[PDB]
């Protein structure tokens, strides 16, 4: 039974039935204001405080600033975390990509880090504004990324709740691990649910299951 | 947490909780006649008359006389207040947008203006065909005004009311905010909902609430 | 409160609240046989007709001849308005364009204007050259009512989805299928800078032309 | 405007006289639709019952083939053609050409009617300019002053009039013939979508292909 | 009165009301798996077998092996046919040069029947399907000799062919489908349009068997 | 009759009436986490423990240690097949793909392979921008046929009721067509297995539940 990391989100590990699996790279795909960021902090977060493993969060839009003052909404000082050397948050804004796998390389390796968090690949070709080379380019990353051990958790934009996982059609087959994160909206409200569409070499919950986003980060609910 | 300045438009200060946050970038995408320009004048209006922030109105489009003539039908006199230089409307009707971005910077220093809008940032990308590079230069716009620390209203254009939430599909995820207007029709009637689809860092209410424009502009129902 | 002139279309002086914006460009957009050419052309008659505001008709498919023969049909006479120096009608069948537009509204001292249909010249950029005409007809001060054209009944409200926020206010014209029946309905979408009743409302054509049906 | 009859039973009463004359009528349809019968009957009809003469012009199939599917409705077109009452253009980037070749037939002929059948697949045989060839086509017949039956192609039997969606604008009239299928089952309706300057009824009407050709049930 | 041409398939001489016109081409269009190789099959083994008329089969992508094969599923030995020279297996795998290829063999064989799977296949050359396909159709018509062509298709109630001109080039048009409900398959076969005559409308069950194609006609 | 080879994996060999094809290829498609490439090991699995039939797996995306690692949780011993030589898994991770067609020629023949597995067929024509696909792929297709070998190719997909494969043209090339589903309705997912089509063969019709346990696929016909 291939070996997991305990996220530690309330829920999540009930579903995914013990965590993320190490060394492996997750993709936790949705529309805006999902909640990719946010997992993707959590992830990180509960990482230094539960297990004492120090995390990688690699930026291409929002600053460390913003990512930082975003996370005081939820009682965390990621201010301090830096400080101490747990946490390393890596600005790969704009001013082949073996450029900045490179960089987060030698970021994993000098802080030792266990936890990876890239937030969000998409925009980095949407950039680039070359929709061609992904499949190549995604698959280079999460390669270089499964030699160094370390777990990762990249996340992806989509348009629509029920439509493609991704924006390309190809970021679910290039990645282990598939989260989907929805905020359907009918009769005018929304409901936010998430799903394990997929995990390889290891057993999940299927189907979606609801949660809400509130001063303690994400809650799952398992049925 | 992120704190936010009240927009004065009844009822949104009840969804946003508070209102828009200080410094971020707010997107509002929506059909045509939705009500895009009204809030982003609403919003620029109300920071003058109620608490003295000065702000600046971006227009691509619409030329200036037309914002003019257009809000004297709510009772503002923003010509009066281009007179006082409490608000400017600056005229950007006709790949880079770094000229753009500068003559704003400029306004608000000149000004000293808190609120700003523009409307519409869709016009102004397909006006030079330049569709490749949305992202990319829609992120340098946001980008700055953060650093000049205003707090900024974007409009864009929709073609469907549950379709794509802005025209390219990428300008919802650039943005801090996403407030989102919709004109839906349905047994030959139309409904006017808003919703605050996201807000970086703080609260809000969820999903879609009623409104109307009447003659004192944007009315919103919340529901709790 | 802006300044409108009324069509004297039966039932849309009611939707609009006092007719279209002056000086102002109107989108009318519609499926094919939905009635945006007679809508076009009772706008310029009944602006003749009722307060003898001379009128522009640039038209770029259909000829001079056949809009007349097709008037006819409502027992209006285009030949006679044509030969009095109250209608004229600029045969085109986009800066050049509008120089032979300016000339016409100036010789006329037209203060009415309808182009049908927009669309088809570019078939024959779309936000740029809509742009520089919407702009121009602006600068000069004359109301405009601009056909465009769709292929779905509840799609895009133009064809290329950029027409609609180019226009000051749109109007929607819809032909609907439903049991083997069809429905004519018009709606006003957006009128910049002032109120209109919102929704579909049935309407027919006649032999007094277009006839609209407000509800409340 | 004055409308010719077209003698189809039920069209007339449906448009209400005819087809409008030195007008052109599009006639979009599916596949077996009876876009090529309609067309056909146009022809025979005014050649039999008003000795107007008509110009049928083919892209795909072939005079012998036309002659040859007709004979199955008790229509014998190889009289009409000995007789000189009609004329089979066989026309197996500009449309100038065929213009012009088609003018010659209907001055020759001393034709009234005209149809063709189908400007969609000279367009196809890769000319995706549709409009500005055939408003050419439309705006010289409407100056010869022949009433056509331009037939053309569409997949969808709810979707577009046409296959470009541009077709039917130029056109100053329209027909829809549509074979929507339901439970297993076909139905045959036509529908008279436009008439520019005149009156006509709405909606779709059942009709059939018989033995002798089309037959539409006017519900009013 | 166009005169038709017996398939001798089980229920589809009654929906075509006599058979396939003579010296016409059949478009047979269906999804994967609908029967379209079987049908084309059956047209030439039953000619062959009842008729005694020579056929040409056409493949651009299944190999002569592989077909010989197939047909033995039904207790059909296309070999023994090809031995005779009643059949002849014109292989395509890599557009006038096929034509003066096929109007060889026809013309070499003395063959009434002929089939094409499929027409999909030959075409990124998609802008000129259109006039190739009626460069074949055409030449087939001129030659005499009734042709079945199958095309391919995505969905089951979505366009005719693959790329809404097949359908229009076709004299005849047979549409086969393999629709599913409720997780079960339904196979119904449609004849769409013959041009001249008359035939039954609307979709008619049918079943594969160890005998091949079974319509069941409900007239 | 045409002759089939026992795939073992429960209840498929019920619906496919005795296996796949021999020497034929058969087309595995489905969205992500379907089972494809799951379906693609217990292939080569099957066919070594029970018939000592030895197999090639071509993979594109996962690396050999991983597809070895995740068949650890079924309790199948991969590692040890490759140092019996019974299981090969060809490196495929970085328009023509004859070098490919070589290098799996040469492993078929060296390990006297008759089971094939190439997971997934898709991902090249992506990794590549070769979206010449039916043309590429009929090569591989017909080379595979020639060498006389059992194929199993996976294909990825968008929709669960579309299109059949990525490019609508996969499912013509080859001879056989297996469709993995999991349909979301009601919050909760749905596992389903059909066989589209079998050349020359009868098979069962419509769609058949099935889930992926601690021993693989199982499939239940009705
Ligand atoms: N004085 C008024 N009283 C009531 N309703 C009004 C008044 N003025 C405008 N409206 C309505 O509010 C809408 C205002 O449109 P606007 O604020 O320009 O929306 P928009 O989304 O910017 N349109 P567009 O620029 O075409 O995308 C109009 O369509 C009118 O229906
Ligand atoms: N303190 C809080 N309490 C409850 N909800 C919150 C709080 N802070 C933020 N949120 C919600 O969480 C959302 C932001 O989460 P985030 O992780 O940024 O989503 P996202 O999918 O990354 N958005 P984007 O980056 O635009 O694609 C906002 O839309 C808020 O509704
Ligand atoms: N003699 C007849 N008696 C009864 N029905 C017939 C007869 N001839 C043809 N039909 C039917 O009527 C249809 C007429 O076809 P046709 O007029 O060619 O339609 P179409 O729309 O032109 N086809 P296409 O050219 O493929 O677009 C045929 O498909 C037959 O089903
Ligand atoms: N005298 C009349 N009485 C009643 N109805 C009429 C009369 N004349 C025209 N119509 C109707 O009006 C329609 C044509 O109106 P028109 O104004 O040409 O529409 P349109 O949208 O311009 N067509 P197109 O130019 O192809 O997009 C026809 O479908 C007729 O049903
Ligand atoms: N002996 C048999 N008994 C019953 N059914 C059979 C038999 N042989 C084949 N079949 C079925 O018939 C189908 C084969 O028909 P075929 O004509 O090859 O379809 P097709 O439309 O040509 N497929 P494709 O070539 O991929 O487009 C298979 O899907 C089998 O399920
Ligand atoms: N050991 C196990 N026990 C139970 N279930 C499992 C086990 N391992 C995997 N699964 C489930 O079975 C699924 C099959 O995965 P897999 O066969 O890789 O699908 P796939 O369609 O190839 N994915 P992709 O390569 O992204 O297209 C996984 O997503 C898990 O949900
Ligand atoms: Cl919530
Ligand atoms: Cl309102
Ligand atoms: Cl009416
Ligand atoms: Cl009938
Ligand atoms: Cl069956
Ligand atoms: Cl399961
Ligand atoms: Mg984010
Ligand atoms: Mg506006
Ligand atoms: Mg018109
Ligand atoms: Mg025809
Ligand atoms: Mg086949
Ligand atoms: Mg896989």
Redesign the interface.
Known sequence: ??AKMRTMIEGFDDISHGGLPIGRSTLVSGT??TGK?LFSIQFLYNGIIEFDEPGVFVTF?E?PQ?II??A??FGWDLAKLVDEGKLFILDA??DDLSALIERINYAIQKYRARRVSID?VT?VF??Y?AS??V??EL?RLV?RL?QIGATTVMTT?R?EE?G??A?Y??E???S?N?VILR?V?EG???RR?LEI???????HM????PFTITDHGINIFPL
């Open positions: 039974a291939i805006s204001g960021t839009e600053t913003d003052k975003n005081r909404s804004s704009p969000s925009s949407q950039q504004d061609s080379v499949r190549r698959f390669a499964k934009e348009i029920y493609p996982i924006r059609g190809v679910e087959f290039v282990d598939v905020n909206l005018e409200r929304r649910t569409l997929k995990l390889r070499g290891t057993w299927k189907g979606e299951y």
